[PDB]
Design an enzyme around this catalytic site. Structure first.
Site, PDB file in Angstrom:
ATOM      1  N   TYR B 333       0.828  -1.202   0.000  1.00  8.82           N
ATOM      2  CA  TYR B 333       0.000   0.000   0.000  1.00  8.82           C
ATOM      3  C   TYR B 333       0.864   1.255   0.000  1.00  8.82           C
ATOM      4  CZ  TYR B 333      -4.881  -1.485   0.613  1.00  8.82           C
ATOM      5  OH  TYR B 333      -6.151  -1.969   0.422  1.00  8.82           O
ATOM      6  N   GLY B 445     -13.045   1.465   2.645  1.00  9.81           N
ATOM      7  CA  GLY B 445     -12.482   2.443   3.572  1.00  9.81           C
ATOM      8  C   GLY B 445     -12.875   3.864   3.307  1.00  9.81           C
ATOM      9  N   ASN B 481      -7.522   5.395   7.898  1.00  9.77           N
ATOM     10  CA  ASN B 481      -7.428   4.837   6.557  1.00  9.77           C
ATOM     11  C   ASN B 481      -6.023   4.952   5.986  1.00  9.77           C
ATOM     12  OD1 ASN B 481     -10.348   4.333   6.421  1.00  9.77           O
ATOM     13  ND2 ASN B 481     -10.479   6.572   6.362  1.00  9.77           N
TER      14      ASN B 481
HETATM   15  C1  F43 Z   1     -10.053 -10.361   3.102  1.00  9.58           C
HETATM   16  C2  F43 Z   1      -9.946  -8.839   2.892  1.00  9.58           C
HETATM   17  C3  F43 Z   1     -10.845  -8.186   3.952  1.00  9.58           C
HETATM   18  C4  F43 Z   1      -9.924  -7.392   4.838  1.00  9.58           C
HETATM   19  O1  F43 Z   1     -10.230  -6.813   5.874  1.00  9.58           O
HETATM   20  N1  F43 Z   1      -8.690  -7.445   4.320  1.00  9.58           N
HETATM   21  C5  F43 Z   1      -8.509  -8.288   3.133  1.00  9.58           C
HETATM   22  C6  F43 Z   1      -7.333  -9.244   3.409  1.00  9.58           C
HETATM   23  C7  F43 Z   1      -6.268  -8.447   4.158  1.00  9.58           C
HETATM   24  C8  F43 Z   1      -5.080  -9.132   4.791  1.00  9.58           C
HETATM   25  C9  F43 Z   1      -4.458 -10.165   3.859  1.00  9.58           C
HETATM   26  C10 F43 Z   1      -4.279 -11.545   4.492  1.00  9.58           C
HETATM   27  C11 F43 Z   1      -3.512 -12.487   3.615  1.00  9.58           C
HETATM   28  O2  F43 Z   1      -2.417 -12.228   3.172  1.00  9.58           O
HETATM   29  O3  F43 Z   1      -4.222 -13.515   3.224  1.00  9.58           O
HETATM   30  C12 F43 Z   1      -4.246  -7.883   5.132  1.00  9.58           C
HETATM   31  C13 F43 Z   1      -2.729  -8.137   5.091  1.00  9.58           C
HETATM   32  C14 F43 Z   1      -4.598  -7.259   6.497  1.00  9.58           C
HETATM   33  C15 F43 Z   1      -3.997  -8.045   7.643  1.00  9.58           C
HETATM   34  N2  F43 Z   1      -3.147  -7.399   8.425  1.00  9.58           N
HETATM   35  O4  F43 Z   1      -4.300  -9.231   7.818  1.00  9.58           O
HETATM   36  C16 F43 Z   1      -4.580  -7.007   3.939  1.00  9.58           C
HETATM   37  N3  F43 Z   1      -5.678  -7.313   3.376  1.00  9.58           N
HETATM   38 NI1  F43 Z   1      -6.408  -6.346   1.659  1.00  9.58          NI
HETATM   39  N4  F43 Z   1      -4.522  -5.786   1.099  1.00  9.58           N
HETATM   40  C17 F43 Z   1      -4.080  -5.178  -0.011  1.00  9.58           C
HETATM   41  C18 F43 Z   1      -4.831  -4.787  -1.135  1.00  9.58           C
HETATM   42  C19 F43 Z   1      -6.171  -5.165  -1.260  1.00  9.58           C
HETATM   43  C20 F43 Z   1      -7.026  -4.843  -2.457  1.00  9.58           C
HETATM   44  C21 F43 Z   1      -6.594  -5.727  -3.637  1.00  9.58           C
HETATM   45  C22 F43 Z   1      -6.865  -5.139  -5.018  1.00  9.58           C
HETATM   46  C23 F43 Z   1      -7.401  -6.154  -5.983  1.00  9.58           C
HETATM   47  O5  F43 Z   1      -6.478  -6.667  -6.758  1.00  9.58           O
HETATM   48  O6  F43 Z   1      -8.548  -6.542  -5.966  1.00  9.58           O
HETATM   49  C24 F43 Z   1      -8.430  -5.306  -2.004  1.00  9.58           C
HETATM   50  C25 F43 Z   1      -9.443  -4.200  -1.781  1.00  9.58           C
HETATM   51  C26 F43 Z   1     -10.447  -4.116  -2.885  1.00  9.58           C
HETATM   52  O7  F43 Z   1     -11.684  -4.335  -2.488  1.00  9.58           O
HETATM   53  O8  F43 Z   1     -10.165  -3.704  -3.989  1.00  9.58           O
HETATM   54  C27 F43 Z   1      -8.127  -6.035  -0.731  1.00  9.58           C
HETATM   55  C28 F43 Z   1      -9.110  -6.741  -0.136  1.00  9.58           C
HETATM   56  C29 F43 Z   1      -9.103  -7.478   1.069  1.00  9.58           C
HETATM   57  N5  F43 Z   1      -8.161  -7.444   1.953  1.00  9.58           N
HETATM   58  C30 F43 Z   1     -10.307  -8.343   1.440  1.00  9.58           C
HETATM   59  C31 F43 Z   1     -10.666  -9.375   0.351  1.00  9.58           C
HETATM   60  C32 F43 Z   1      -9.480 -10.073  -0.317  1.00  9.58           C
HETATM   61  C33 F43 Z   1      -9.866 -11.043  -1.392  1.00  9.58           C
HETATM   62  O9  F43 Z   1      -9.002 -11.045  -2.376  1.00  9.58           O
HETATM   63  O10 F43 Z   1     -10.638 -11.956  -1.195  1.00  9.58           O
HETATM   64  N6  F43 Z   1      -6.861  -5.893  -0.299  1.00  9.58           N
HETATM   65  C34 F43 Z   1      -4.143  -3.986  -2.187  1.00  9.58           C
HETATM   66  O11 F43 Z   1      -4.733  -3.156  -2.866  1.00  9.58           O
HETATM   67  C35 F43 Z   1      -2.641  -3.939  -2.142  1.00  9.58           C
HETATM   68  C36 F43 Z   1      -2.100  -3.821  -0.731  1.00  9.58           C
HETATM   69  C37 F43 Z   1      -2.574  -5.041   0.055  1.00  9.58           C
HETATM   70  C38 F43 Z   1      -2.220  -5.135   1.544  1.00  9.58           C
HETATM   71  C39 F43 Z   1      -0.872  -5.798   1.834  1.00  9.58           C
HETATM   72  C40 F43 Z   1       0.337  -5.092   1.278  1.00  9.58           C
HETATM   73  O12 F43 Z   1       0.467  -3.887   1.288  1.00  9.58           O
HETATM   74  O13 F43 Z   1       1.254  -5.912   0.832  1.00  9.58           O
HETATM   75  C41 F43 Z   1      -3.366  -6.063   1.982  1.00  9.58           C
HETATM   76  C42 F43 Z   1      -3.693  -5.916   3.470  1.00  9.58           C
HETATM   77  C1  LIG Z   2     -12.455   1.534  14.171  1.00 10.97           C
HETATM   78  C2  LIG Z   2     -11.589   1.382  15.399  1.00 10.97           C
HETATM   79  O1  LIG Z   2     -11.701  -0.008  15.845  1.00 10.97           O
HETATM   80  P1  LIG Z   2     -12.623  -0.391  17.110  1.00 10.97           P
HETATM   81  O2  LIG Z   2     -14.057  -0.266  16.638  1.00 10.97           O
HETATM   82  O3  LIG Z   2     -12.268   0.603  18.195  1.00 10.97           O
HETATM   83  O4  LIG Z   2     -12.246  -1.811  17.471  1.00 10.97           O
HETATM   84  C3  LIG Z   2     -10.118   1.721  15.109  1.00 10.97           C
HETATM   85  N1  LIG Z   2      -9.733   1.223  13.804  1.00 10.97           N
HETATM   86  C4  LIG Z   2      -8.721   1.765  13.127  1.00 10.97           C
HETATM   87  O5  LIG Z   2      -8.444   2.957  13.212  1.00 10.97           O
HETATM   88  C5  LIG Z   2      -7.924   0.820  12.257  1.00 10.97           C
HETATM   89  C6  LIG Z   2      -6.776   1.494  11.582  1.00 10.97           C
HETATM   90  C7  LIG Z   2      -6.012   0.587  10.636  1.00 10.97           C
HETATM   91  C8  LIG Z   2      -6.849  -0.514  10.049  1.00 10.97           C
HETATM   92  C9  LIG Z   2      -7.399  -0.176   8.686  1.00 10.97           C
HETATM   93  C10 LIG Z   2      -6.381   0.530   7.803  1.00 10.97           C
HETATM   94  S1  LIG Z   2      -7.037   1.025   6.193  1.00 10.97           S
HETATM   95  C11 LIG Z   2      -9.209   1.149  16.213  1.00 10.97           C
HETATM   96  O6  LIG Z   2      -8.437   0.219  15.900  1.00 10.97           O
HETATM   97  O7  LIG Z   2      -9.300   1.654  17.346  1.00 10.97           O
HETATM   98  O1  LIG Z   3     -11.475  -5.023   1.284  1.00  8.84           O
HETATM   99  S1  LIG Z   3     -11.218  -3.948   2.306  1.00  8.84           S
HETATM  100  O2  LIG Z   3     -11.389  -2.578   1.708  1.00  8.84           O
HETATM  101  O3  LIG Z   3     -12.312  -4.235   3.303  1.00  8.84           O
HETATM  102  C1  LIG Z   3      -9.573  -4.119   3.056  1.00  8.84           C
HETATM  103  C2  LIG Z   3      -8.485  -4.093   1.985  1.00  8.84           C
HETATM  104  S2  LIG Z   3      -6.856  -4.163   2.779  1.00  8.84           S
END
Ligand code: F43
Ligand SMILES: C[C@@H](OP(=O)(O)O)[C@H](NC(=O)CCCCCCS)C(=O)O
Ligand SMILES: O=S(=O)(O)CCS
Lengths: 259, 550, 442, 442, 101
Positions: B333, B445, B481
């Site tokens: 990201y 977000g 965010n």
């Molecule tokens: C399961 C979730 C729900 C949630 O809260 N987070 C997820 C998953 C989560 C996990 C990934 C766990 C793993 O590696 O299996 C983490 C790392 C958060 C965490 N600390 O656990 C993460 N995403 Ni998300 N997540 C990302 C991203 C994204 C983009 C992916 C774009 C696309 O190709 O569709 C989309 C958001 C979208 O709706 O567009 C996304 C969704 C999602 N993201 C959706 C559904 C994923 C799916 O493919 O089924 N991530 C990205 O856009 C790139 C950065 C990337 C983060 C990790 C990094 O920076 O390397 C990661 C960040």
């Molecule tokens: C909503 C609030 O969570 P709670 O409702 O308080 O559990 C709050 N989230 C965040 O600010 C999460 C920040 C990073 C996770 C999403 C990044 S896009 C927090 O952790 O205190």
């Molecule tokens: O798919 S979500 O926008 O909920 C989280 C992506 S890291």
């Protein structure tokens, strides 16, 4: 009364967005997938079992007398207490006919009692299970809103909306829920949207050709038509931004004279 | 056409960058990456030796990784490449040291202390006495106890990164002081920048205490201020032989460690409860002053982009990545703002368009300049994604494109106007224009602060108004965010880089982080993240001398 | 009625005012004067127009050492002053018969604004005053001098200072006697935020009036904390009456009896007075003499000891003419009294513990600041429930200018703003008058 | 007086009450019902007597899964609830006619106390009610059942969980509608710390009453935060009148016109009504034929859009009968309204962004949860100043039981205690009466 | 201090109820064992969804464990002993019975 205009713009993409936004516009029928096939593709339940229940039916349970709540009729799955399920689509950025914000807006302006959520890589709809199956089969699958090559229904591991298409013109899918057979030219689904394999492959139909995809898409592209060819949408966006800024600064009529 | 991001696309993609088609499912899975293979062998060895059979890393379960080509990542303005796993903050010691050096920094002024020593305590304050005090605090700050061998002390090799430095706007005091522990403004800054910083600071003397990194590792960020204050008080009552049991010593303690303390970050309230010197409390102007690119560069785009990279690697990777969420995190990201020259190309186009149309800083900040500059930069950045499929494949997430384009638009507006709030207004307009262009925006977000922002960018209400330099992760719209906070600091820097300013918010923070004794040098943040990715960065805070070798 | 205790009220000169006054006549729940001071503290805002002008002219927004180049506004807030005050009053006005009062202090360089009680009647906390005043001042500055739309953030930063980032008013030029409710040591600690120096400067360095102010705030806070509820209410009312309001002239009598004396002589006079009044009696005589003493009235003995504590601080700090002795006097007054009588000290050792806190806070390099910045909303000084802070006011009133944290250095604005109100400048006289007005209803 | 625009008044059934009511008649600074609601919400404390008995009987002090073996007390508080309530009333009483009421709820299982107003007049904040109730309950339990001196600590731990260590009331059996001041995310946010589930359970799941309760609390909070002062006040007054009280019957008429409709049909109904009322006019016609609209009245268009937002939420969540649709409806009502008209959203996009974050934290792993646990003090739903929370309250009223963290699960003690008062349960019929009482004073 | 700081106990009983009655997914000890196998990979920082994701080095997370304990003996019987904290094995009999109660 007031006649809606849905979106601005005179270009073909803006016209497609207006058509998707218009609930009185009849979406073009392209496929015919049976209800059982769509149910087995969603993977929530097998075709043949009863709808499971998250809360008792509204007739059996008792509520308080609320005048404002009880003059809105509910969905048929709401009065039966059906569980809320999901259908989630990934739309390619290379001239897919439906796009995530476009879909969301169209689903909120067309369907009743749905939860629409947009992302870059996925767009998800949450509704009561029977109603979800009904509108999914009737609208989301066998219309111009769906293309088996550039749009795939993926409940998890969504990736490929911004990646290049393969040699068959199909979107990338890590789980490979969608396959292309060259001897028939159709597109087959071998797994559900979660990724669990099915008992038998289910045919969704032939992919939409690229020339047709250019004239039905709702996305702006430099190789297609661009926002520079549609200055009215940009002007509306700038007006919305300026109105937001002036309302945030001072919300008076004198501040909005400089709009 | 020639683009700055083209070379990284040729190196990272075998196919032509404008080619619309490729193939997948033939890369062997996770075996295509040497980092994943190293992780697998390390996992098997670690499980069998330490874990006694408990599974730790199982690539077979979960997503089948490596279905597409796992591309390497360049680092902008640097000629080196690395895998994406090397840019994770847990796997990168340079990002950890980047946060460690900021966390362990406290700036304390010594002018009320000197005045109390001269008048109330009746002790003369000479440059020789200041040198003696500096020797005492340099011995005492890491773990030392002055002339008390019976006292328990920290091992000196365990705190090799600890230093106590001094700087002053008074020139004759500067040349009368020892150069061993002096941050010389004149030889570390250009002449106009040194004159501006000396005028802003005044004729006052400040000390920079670099608490050892291990203290921040074991404890939290609010530990640093107490550690520095305690050691400063002890060194002051030792070097100047004063009684430590009278009320005059209490007044001197206030004057020496509670009068002019400059902290890196403020404490955070509510559900985000944290102490000072935590990355949620760091304002955007303070972080702009931490990065020292105005010292060594005159290009405003590069000056803003180094702050963009530092803000990404702090706010998105560490703060929001672990402090607020945790897990795998938000590494790519944030790296998308500093891997290839995509943001560099977009920002240089913004600078070129602003220079051709509005001059360098030739226009007062009005609405129309913000609208047309942000719209032009957004349209260019989005059509660049349109005609380069490799560019779209590199920035696969719509958040890791919205931010980049909006950061370029805000940087261009801040060039044209010099106002940071105008730049953030251009950011918000770019976000909504991106949304209407691609029918797409980030994650699900991701635009709470980008549809709201438009109204809160120039607001005057209590919880909505702030200059962008005074904003930070504790600003209510920016609290949750990812993909905004790092680029906001670059926009705040771009407002002052357009004016050629020596600093953005705090002159004292700017001088303090110009210290050559810092292990992480903030002059080239992109280059050292490359060094930490290639495992050639010597970080601090390692307990190698108190641990067994077997 | 529920308390049969009667007190005789005296003025600051030791002359009798009235006799047989009921104990609840000075209660915070009954006294109209204490209610008026609480409401006035809740609704009074101090505005530094000269600070706003200096911050905007140099671009000194932010905090300590912070300066933003290019965000400088050249306005004349002190020169206009009356127009800004009229605009702020017009914005803050609710009804025409409102209590909105924006007065001009020190010839235009400061403003003393009192927001109406209508805005506080529908507020759960006192912070509506400062936020409303900040909004009215921002609007008045933007409309008076035609500030550009892109500099309203600079105006907000100059007025309030880092608020959305730092939940406080740090680098601004707007102040109140109460801090942020999220920055309290405990729940109900809002009224223990006024330091000793603010109370001394408000009362114009008068001994008894500063003692009365500190005691009224501390005991009203104990009522706010729920501490003075049930069986503790009598002890807190007696403590307030005998320590702050000079009930039965005890403080003045002890000071007069110990003009040449020491702390031990004050202890002796307190024990003699408590024996003569029947408050304490002999418990038993040990083998080695030392007839033990027990309280016939526990709360009255605590009140007598608190009055003697104030008198001992006054005697020692008037002998030394220095305010550095407060901690030792409280600590060893309690110690000498306890090991002289076998009786508990003031607040059953909490006053002695808070004196140990004062000792380590104002006498070492581990300490910080002097006794003038003592307030009950601090972790060092919170332990005594309104029995250790009012003597510090007498100590700072007896100081002959040998403290770095003088009231002139730290509370000049507070004195100039809050000294105009009669119930704040002379809290003792008006609290006594308010008690006299409600004598017959008990 | 300063606002010349009048409103009508309609009840929750859509029947006309009165016409030509001035806008300031429903203002928090003028309406007696809103003032009484704020005063009563600060003094009402919910007490779980059965929770106290169960905590003491099993030694469940400490919080989540905490047991202290040995500190077990066997009391019969539910059986002796009348004596406990009498003792609490005796302790908390100031005079004999003070508005002190300790009513017994659910046969002694719950207790609803109201500390007197005079106890809060001298308090700077609202925490005096819960602390005073805790102290009165501690004394009543100590003197009713003869509890040993060494077990009063256990009694305190049962009543308030870990208060000296954790500045909150988490493991205790005492509660209030407002949260602790230490949990405030900004100054003036005390009235924003009422969760949606608490407001829904207080109004007994009545949609219009919950909308009125949430809107009154949120707009009174915006008055408290200083947001709704000066030129900002008219917008919040119209938002309270139209979204929350259905002034011109806009909410009921829109819901009736879209009984079998979608969000888009509500959007066109709102635009048609705003055009017919003269609130918006055509600015210009573009080359594509798009009619760009401008507001003839900015604040009235804001209020119309807010009322339509509530109507769209009610329509969609009454069709689905599930409360998980609020974030999507609030997002896309504004999203299609802005690109249909060229006009700004409900709160100039501060509320659409609130929905974009609500859609994050109601459908992701990163925090938040169900819609019922959010509030105006939450970091996700603080950004819209009183225009996004009454839709969430309406949707949770329309929920048929698809939520795990329901108001029954979350707010059982608070809802049952605060539903016993007519002003909290049905705020519409009393706020309208309070407006009628002062209709002729403008 | 590190071991105390990095320890968080979460009750997995409301999550099972959410799986059972909101999603209609049955929870068996086989599914609990599969969940434990998954979380012992995910808690150090492994990737389970979201193709093209980076992971932390397992050499830096060798001390990361996800463990489960139950007061139910029947559930603890057919649970994988790799992830299980056994109260009956680690405590004396009276202490074990007191803890289970
Ligand atoms: C399961 C979730 C729900 C949630 O809260 N987070 C997820 C998953 C989560 C996990 C990934 C766990 C793993 O590696 O299996 C983490 C790392 C958060 C965490 N600390 O656990 C993460 N995403 Ni998300 N997540 C990302 C991203 C994204 C983009 C992916 C774009 C696309 O190709 O569709 C989309 C958001 C979208 O709706 O567009 C996304 C969704 C999602 N993201 C959706 C559904 C994923 C799916 O493919 O089924 N991530 C990205 O856009 C790139 C950065 C990337 C983060 C990790 C990094 O920076 O390397 C990661 C960040
Ligand atoms: C909503 C609030 O969570 P709670 O409702 O308080 O559990 C709050 N989230 C965040 O600010 C999460 C920040 C990073 C996770 C999403 C990044 S896009 C927090 O952790 O205190
Ligand atoms: O798919 S979500 O926008 O909920 C989280 C992506 S890291």
């Amino acid at each position: 009364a007031y006649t809606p205009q849905f979106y601005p713009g005179a270009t073909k993409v803006a016209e497609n967005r207006r058509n998707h936004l218009n609930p009185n516009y009849e979406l073009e029928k392209l496929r015919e997938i049976p209800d059982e096939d769509v149910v087995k593709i969603m993977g929530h339940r097998q075709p043949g079992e009863d709808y499971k229940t998250v809360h008792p039916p509204l007739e059996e349970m008792d509520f308080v007398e609320d005048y404002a709540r009880d003059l809105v009729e509910p969905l048929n799955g709401a009065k039966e207490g059906h569980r809320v399920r999901y259908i989630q689509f990934a739309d390619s950025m290379y001239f897919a006919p439906a796009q995530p914000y476009d879909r969301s807006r169209s689903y909120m302006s067309r369907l009743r009692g749905v939860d629409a959520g947009t992302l870059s890589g996925r767009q998800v709809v949450e509704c009561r299970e029977s109603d979800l199956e009904e509108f999914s089969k009737n609208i989301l699958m066998d219309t111009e809103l769906f293309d088996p090559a550039t749009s795939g229904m993926r409940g998890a591991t969504v990736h490929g909306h911004s990646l290049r298409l393969d040699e068959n013109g199909m979107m990338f899918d890590a789980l490979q829920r969608c396959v292309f057979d060259e001897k028939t030219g159709h597109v087959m689904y071998v797994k559900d949207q979660v990724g669990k394999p099915l008992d038998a492959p289910v045919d969704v139909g032939e992919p939409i050709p690229e020339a047709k995809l250019r004239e039905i898409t709702t996305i702006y592209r430099n190789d297609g038509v661009a926002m520079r060819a549609d200055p009215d949408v940009i002007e509306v966006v700038k007006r919305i931004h300026r109105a937001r800024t002036l309302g945030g600064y001072i919300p008076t009529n004198e501040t909005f004279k400089g709009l | 056409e020639k683009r700055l991001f083209l070379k990284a696309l040729k190196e990272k993609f075998e196919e032509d960058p404008k080619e619309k088609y490729t193939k997948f499912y033939t890369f062997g899975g996770w075996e295509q990456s040497a980092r994943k293979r190293e992780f697998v062998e390390a996992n098997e060895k670690i499980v069998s030796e330490k874990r006694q059979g408990i599974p730790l890393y199982n690539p077979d379960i979960g997503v089948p990784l490596g279905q597409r080509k796992l591309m390497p990542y360049k680092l902008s303005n640097t000629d080196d490449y690395c895998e994406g796993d090397d840019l994770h903050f847990l796997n990168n010691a340079a990002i950890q040291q980047l946060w460690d050096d900021i966390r362990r920094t406290v700036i304390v002024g010594m002018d009320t202390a000197h005045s109390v020593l001269e008048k109330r305590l009746g002790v003369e304050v000479t440059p020789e006495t200041i040198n003696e005090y500096m020797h005492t605090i340099n011995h005492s700050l890491p773990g030392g106890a002055v002339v008390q061998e019976h006292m328990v002390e920290v091992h000196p090799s365990l705190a090799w990164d600890c230093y106590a430095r001094i700087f002053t706007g008074d020139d004759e005091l500067a040349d009368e002081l020892d150069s061993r522990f002096l941050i010389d403004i004149n030889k570390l800054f250009p002449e106009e920048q040194a004159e501006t910083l000396k005028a802003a600071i005044g004729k006052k003397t400040y000390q920079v205490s670099r608490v050892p990194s291990l203290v921040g590792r074991v404890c939290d960020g609010g530990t640093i201020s107490r550690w520095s204050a305690m050691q400063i008080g002890m060194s002051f009552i030792t070097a100047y032989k004063l009684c430590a049991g009278e009320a005059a010593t209490a007044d001197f303690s206030y004057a020496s460690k509670h009068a002019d303390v400059i902290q890196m970050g403020n404490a955070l309230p509510g559900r985000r409860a944290r102490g000072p010197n935590e990355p949620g409390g760091i304002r955007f102007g303070i972080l702009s002053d931490v990065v020292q690119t105005t010292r060594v560069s005159e290009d405003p785009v590069e000056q803003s982009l180094e702050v963009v990279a530092t803000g990404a690697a702090l706010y998105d990777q560490i703060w929001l990545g672990a402090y607020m969420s945790g897990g795998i995190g938000f590494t790519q990201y944030a790296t998308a703002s500093y891997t290839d020259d995509i943001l560099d190309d977009f920002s240089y186009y913004a600078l070129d368009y602003v220079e051709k149309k509005y001059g360098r800083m030739g226009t007062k900040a009005t609405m129309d300049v913000v609208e047309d500059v942000a719209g032009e930069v957004t349209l260019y950045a989005l059509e660049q994604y349109d005609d380069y499929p490799a560019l779209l494949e590199d920035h696969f997430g719509g958040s890791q494109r919205a931010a980049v384009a909006a950061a370029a638009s805000g940087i261009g507006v801040c060039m044209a106007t010099g106002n940071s709030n105008a730049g953030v207004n251009g950011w918000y307009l770019s976000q909504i224009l991106h949304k209407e262009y691609h029918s797409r925006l980030g994650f699900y977000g991701y635009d709470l602060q980008d549809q709201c922002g438009a109204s809160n960018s120039l607001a005057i209400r209590n919880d909505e108004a702030a200059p962008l330099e005074l904003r930070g992760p504790n600003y209510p719209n920016y609290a949750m965010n990812v993909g905004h906070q790092g680029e906001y600091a670059g926009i705040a820097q771009a407002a002052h880089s357009a004016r050629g300013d020596a600093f953005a918010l705090n002159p004292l923070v700017k001088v303090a982080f110009a210290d050559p004794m810092l292990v992480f040098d903030f002059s080239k943040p992109r280059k050292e993240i490359a060094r930490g990715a290639l495992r050639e960065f010597e970080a601090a805070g390692e307990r190698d001398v108190i641990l067994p070798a077997k | 009625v529920k308390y049969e205790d009667k007190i005789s009220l005296y003025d600051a000169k030791g002359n009798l005012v009235a006799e047989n006054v009921p104990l609840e006549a000075i209660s915070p729940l009954y006294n109209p004067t204490i209610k008026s001071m609480v409401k006035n503290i809740k609704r009074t805002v101090a505005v530094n127009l000269a600070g706003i002008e200096g911050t905007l002219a140099a671009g000194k927004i932010g905090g300590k050492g912070c300066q933003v180049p290019g965000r400088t506004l050249d306005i004349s807030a002190v020169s206009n002053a009356q127009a800004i005050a009229d605009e702020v009053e017009k914005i803050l006005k609710v009804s025409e018969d409102d209590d909105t009062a924006v007065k001009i202090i020190n010839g235009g360089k400061q403003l003393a604004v009192q927001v109406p009680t209508a805005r506080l009647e529908v507020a759960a906390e006192y912070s509506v005053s400062m936020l409303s005043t900040a909004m009215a001042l921002k609007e008045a500055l933007i409309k008076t001098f035609n500030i550009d739309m892109f500099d309203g953030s600079t105006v907000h930063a100059a007025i309030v200072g880092n608020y959305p980032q730092v939940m406080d008013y740090a680098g601004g030029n707007i102040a109140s006697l109460l801090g942020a409710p999220s920055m309290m040591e405990g729940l109900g600690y809002a009224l223990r935020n006024i330091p000793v120096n603010h109370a001394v400067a408000t009362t114009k360095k008068n001994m008894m009036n500063a003692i009365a102010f500190s005691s009224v705030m501390e005991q009203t806070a104990t009522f706010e904390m729920g501490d003075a509820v049930g069986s503790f209410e009598r002890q807190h009312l007696l403590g307030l009456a005998y320590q702050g309001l000079n009930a039965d002239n005890l403080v003045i009598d002890f000071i007069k009896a110990n003009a040449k004396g020491t702390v031990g002589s004050v202890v002796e006079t307190v024990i003699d007075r408590a024996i003569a009044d029947g408050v304490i009696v002999v418990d038993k005589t040990m083998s080695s003499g030392f007839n033990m003493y027990k309280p016939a009235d526990v709360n009255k003995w605590n009140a007598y000891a608190a009055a003697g504590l104030v008198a001992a601080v006054a005697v020692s700090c008037g002998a030394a003419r220095a305010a550095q002795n407060v901690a030792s006097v409280i600590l060893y007054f309690n110690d000498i009294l306890e090991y002289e009588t076998g009786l508990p000290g003031v607040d059953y050792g909490r006053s002695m513990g808070t004196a140990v806190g004062f000792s380590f806070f104002s006498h070492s390099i581990y300490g910080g600041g002097g006794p003038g910045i003592f307030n009950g909303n601090h972790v060092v000084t919170r332990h005594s429930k309104g029995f250790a802070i009012p003597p510090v006011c007498a100590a700072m009133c007896a100081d002959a200018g040998t403290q770095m944290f003088s009231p002139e250095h730290t509370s000049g604005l507070v004195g100039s703003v809050y000294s105009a109100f009669d119930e704040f400048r002379e809290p003792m006289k008006y609290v006594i008058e308010g008690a006299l007005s409600i004598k017959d209803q008990f």
